[PDB]
Amino acid sequence: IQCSQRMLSFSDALLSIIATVMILPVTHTEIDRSVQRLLATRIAVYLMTFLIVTVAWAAHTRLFQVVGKTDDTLALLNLACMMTITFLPYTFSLMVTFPDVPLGIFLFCVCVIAIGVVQALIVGYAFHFPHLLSPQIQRSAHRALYRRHVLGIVLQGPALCFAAAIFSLFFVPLSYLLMVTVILLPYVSEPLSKERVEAFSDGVYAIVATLLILDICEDNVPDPKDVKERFSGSLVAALSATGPRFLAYFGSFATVGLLWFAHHSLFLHVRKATRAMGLLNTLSLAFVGGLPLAYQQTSAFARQPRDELERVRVSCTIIFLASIFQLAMWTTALLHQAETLQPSVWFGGREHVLMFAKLALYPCASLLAFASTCLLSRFSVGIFHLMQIAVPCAFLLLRLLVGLALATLRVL
Amino acid sequence: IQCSQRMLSFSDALLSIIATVMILPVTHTEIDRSVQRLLATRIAVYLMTFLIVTVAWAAHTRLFQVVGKTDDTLALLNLACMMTITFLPYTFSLMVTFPDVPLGIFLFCVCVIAIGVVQALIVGYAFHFPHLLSPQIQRSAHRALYRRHVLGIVLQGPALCFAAAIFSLFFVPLSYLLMVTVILLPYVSEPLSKERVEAFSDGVYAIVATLLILDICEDNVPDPKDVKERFSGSLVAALSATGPRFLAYFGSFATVGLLWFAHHSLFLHVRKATRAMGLLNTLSLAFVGGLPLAYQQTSAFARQPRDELERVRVSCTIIFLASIFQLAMWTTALLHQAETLQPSVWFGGREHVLMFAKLALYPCASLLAFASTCLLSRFSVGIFHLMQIAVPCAFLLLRLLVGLALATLRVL
Numbered sequence A, B: 001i002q003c004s005q006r007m008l009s010f011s012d013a014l015l016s017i018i019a020t021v022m023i024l025p026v027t028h029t030e031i032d033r034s035v036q037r038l039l040a041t042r043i044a045v046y047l048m049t050f051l052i053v054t055v056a057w058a059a060h061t062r063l064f065q066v067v068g069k070t071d072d073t074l075a076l077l078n079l080a081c082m083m084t085i086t087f088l089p090y091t092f093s094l095m096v097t098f099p100d101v102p103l104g105i106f107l108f109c110v111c112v113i114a115i116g117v118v119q120a121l122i123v124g125y126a127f128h129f130p131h132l133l134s135p136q137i138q139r140s141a142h143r144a145l146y147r148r149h150v151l152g153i154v155l156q157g158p159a160l161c162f163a164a165a166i167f168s169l170f171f172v173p174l175s176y177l178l179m180v181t182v183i184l185l186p187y188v189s190e191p192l193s194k195e196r197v198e199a200f201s202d203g204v205y206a207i208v209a210t211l212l213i214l215d216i217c218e219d220n221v222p223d224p225k226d227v228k229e230r231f232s233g234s235l236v237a238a239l240s241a242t243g244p245r246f247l248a249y250f251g252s253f254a255t256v257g258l259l260w261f262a263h264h265s266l267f268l269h270v271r272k273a274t275r276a277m278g279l280l281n282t283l284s285l286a287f288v289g290g291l292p293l294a295y296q297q298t299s300a301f302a303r304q305p306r307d308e309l310e311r312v313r314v315s316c317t318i319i320f321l322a323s324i325f326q327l328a329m330w331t332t333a334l335l336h337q338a339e340t341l342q343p344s345v346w347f348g349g350r351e352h353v354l355m356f357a358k359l360a361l362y363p364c365a366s367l368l369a370f371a372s373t374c375l376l377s378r379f380s381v382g383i384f385h386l387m388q389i390a391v392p393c394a395f396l397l398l399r400l401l402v403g404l405a406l407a408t409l410r411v412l
């Protein structure tokens, strides 16, 4: 027997990488109807693959909530499970790119079946050696019924996908219906490990923050030949020619880091994460993945006022979507504060107002910039930049600002 | 005050991404002297940037060993520190690509100075609020001397790099000498947080395992137009045309996952990690980063026997270098087992032989394949594939094999 914490941390790292894999085609899209259609398709594929990989990650998290402690064989089986999961984005992209070809849907169904079969092997091994189970399962007298329930839950998806794979040769629409039913059944018809949620969130945030510097380190180191021919041997000029990329990276890193800061602060006060909090966290991460695209678009900065106005609106919308779901997590937690939140941030608690301000800082700023874009259109672009400067400072001075507001309302 | 564990986990994730960033140019190198020179330059740059980012990560780890507990201001300062660190690979690549241009060396020195200045701000803030310090520092009466020592250690590198930046305008070789002195002084003239080492290692392993699938998901989804024109509308043929990439990914993921399995097993029994163990871990990770290149080269599989023999030798050498340093970590730990290892894996312990076999499995296999390449040249290539099949199975049956060997030696 061994402690399973590090194995699950490795699983979370791999799964965050796999979930965010499909954001690279979006950010590498150079950017007339054809280009817009291509970008929309890529964004939709990214969202769907992120959600699918998140569903797989959640299934893994609760599977290894059932399995309390790990073992060499369990570690190798988990490696096999991760290997199978790493193919979901590619097979899904292949299926959507070739909807009418049965081979793509068959490959996706095979990937899902393989994940389920490896997880069923893990469940069988763990139940054959009860000391690997959680104490709740170990001490229960209905271990056989627990095994049946867990194994049925694990193998539900594989059965539906196997039926879909069969039907692909006869009636494709029913195959797609079964694939969607796979995701529908678990949620249309419990707590989630807070550590797993935190690890997955940290991985996603770390990847999204550094996407643009990863692009820069590969593409934007000047070529000495190009420097000597096109910039008259001036390295400073060659580096200035690529300024917009650096500005995009700075903005994206700052925004993603501050959103992670808000998430970190929120989860420092969470006692237990519910399923609703997990769903809202998934939505927030999915929309967070899109910030690099927003900042690329705004940094490119086509001089046309209408184009730049559209870019600012899109960026503000993306930031609002990223942060409103964190605020929604916090509001959902407040409904069951007694069991979900530490007493510090309960209604009327010491740090309740500070947490509220910290989580509402970004949605308010994004909404204000978006409104300025409609009311103060000419200044709006500058206002957007002002936002990028104001929000970080507000985070530094947040306690002083909250105290000032409290003192002001004391008399008012 | 807040718990600093999640902030440091996020730092480890970001730092692993930044350390492994420069491996992408290596794996994206399509592969006459010019190509070899380009590949050698890219590999050297990757190694140097990995080592530099690891030095920065180690400095960060011990800085936040000094700082016991975190705070909102400390969290934001840490975000700024990570932002500064993310520019080390790009500035180093720019400096090496333009060695004679003072601007590149100046930018690298500025990045180093900025990292040091942010860390000095963190130290000053933590010491101005002693409750953020570790209890050892808090209870000491020499907190002023501790502050002086820590601040000097933090600002050592910035001073040397500032001198180098000045000298770049007058005598460049002395500037380079000072830059190397920055790294020389700390090591030429203590324990390391095992959690930080584990998190960094897991991040690096997770990135390296999935490099090739990240490439595949972007580049190798067939284009319907290409499928219809070049493969006569056969999607299976189009997918078979890209088989070697999938084989390379399978091999690379299996090898990296099993090396991580060996690392995980080793560190499950480590009580405290010393500086020597940290250095050996860094070397092992640096050489692990090169496995995707080895497997790409072997999967490309030019039919020429000499070329394939060279590619098998290179792959075996890379695997041996990756795993021998894990074995060296284990051997170094055995020298101070009493304080470094759990009693289970001490000399003559219950699991000592199993740990030895687990860590020596890969070096022995790689050395045997390399030797077969010289003695059994014609079969060697097949033997390499045999290795890819044998080592995983040996990991599954490792306990049975160890028991069999013990029983055999009982009579012999």
Ligand SMILES: CC(C)CCC[C@@H](C)[C@H]1CC[C@H]2[C@@H]3CC=C4C[C@@H](O)CC[C@]4(C)[C@H]3CC[C@]12C
Pocket (backbone or CB within 6 Å): A110, A113, A155, A158, A159, A162
């Ligand atoms: C053929 C390979 C490539 C992939 C598909 C594997 C097949 C044989 C597996 C995957 C999941 C399995 C199913 C999982 C659960 C159940 C429910 C049980 O009450 C009857 C058997 C049934 C319906 C299984 C039959 C076999 C099954 C469909």
Ligand SMILES: CC(C)CCC[C@@H](C)[C@H]1CC[C@H]2[C@@H]3CC=C4C[C@@H](O)CC[C@]4(C)[C@H]3CC[C@]12C
Pocket (backbone or CB within 6 Å): B110, B113, B155, B158, B159, B162
């Ligand atoms: C100019 C900007 C862009 C970058 C460089 C910042 C300069 C001013 C900073 C960076 C590190 C600093 C040094 C850090 C440590 C010491 C040792 C002390 O006994 C004398 C001052 C001295 C030598 C500092 C002088 C100022 C310094 C060199």
Ligand SMILES: Cc1ccc(-c2ccc(F)cc2COc2ccc(CCC(=O)O)cc2)cc1
Pocket (backbone or CB within 6 Å): A117, A120, A121, A124, A125, A147
């Ligand atoms: C109905 C059905 C059909 C097929 C499969 C199946 C098939 C292939 C496969 F690889 C794994 C599985 C499932 O994996 C196990 C299931 C049970 C057991 C032990 C039994 C116990 O005591 O509960 C061990 C492993 C399962 C159930």
Ligand SMILES: Cc1ccc(-c2ccc(F)cc2COc2ccc(CCC(=O)O)cc2)cc1
Pocket (backbone or CB within 6 Å): B117, B120, B121, B124, B125, B147
């Ligand atoms: C000799 C020298 C020269 C320059 C700098 C410097 C310069 C710029 C900068 F941003 C930060 C620093 C260093 O950051 C601090 C140092 C001390 C203090 C408080 C003093 C205490 O009580 O020890 C707080 C912050 C430091 C030492």
Ligand SMILES: [K+]
Pocket (backbone or CB within 6 Å): A009, A199, B009
């Ligand atoms: K973690």
Ligand SMILES: [K+]
Pocket (backbone or CB within 6 Å): A012, A013, A016, A202, A203, A204, A206, B013, B203
């Ligand atoms: K991670």
Ligand SMILES: [K+]
Pocket (backbone or CB within 6 Å): A017, A207, B017, B207
């Ligand atoms: K990553």
Ligand SMILES: [K+]
Pocket (backbone or CB within 6 Å): A214, B214
């Ligand atoms: K990448």
Ligand SMILES: [K+]
Pocket (backbone or CB within 6 Å): A009, B009, B199
């Ligand atoms: K971790």
Ligand SMILES: [K+]
Pocket (backbone or CB within 6 Å): A013, A203, B012, B013, B016, B199, B202, B203, B204, B206
């Ligand atoms: K990581």
Ligand SMILES: [K+]
Pocket (backbone or CB within 6 Å): none
């Ligand atoms: K290309």
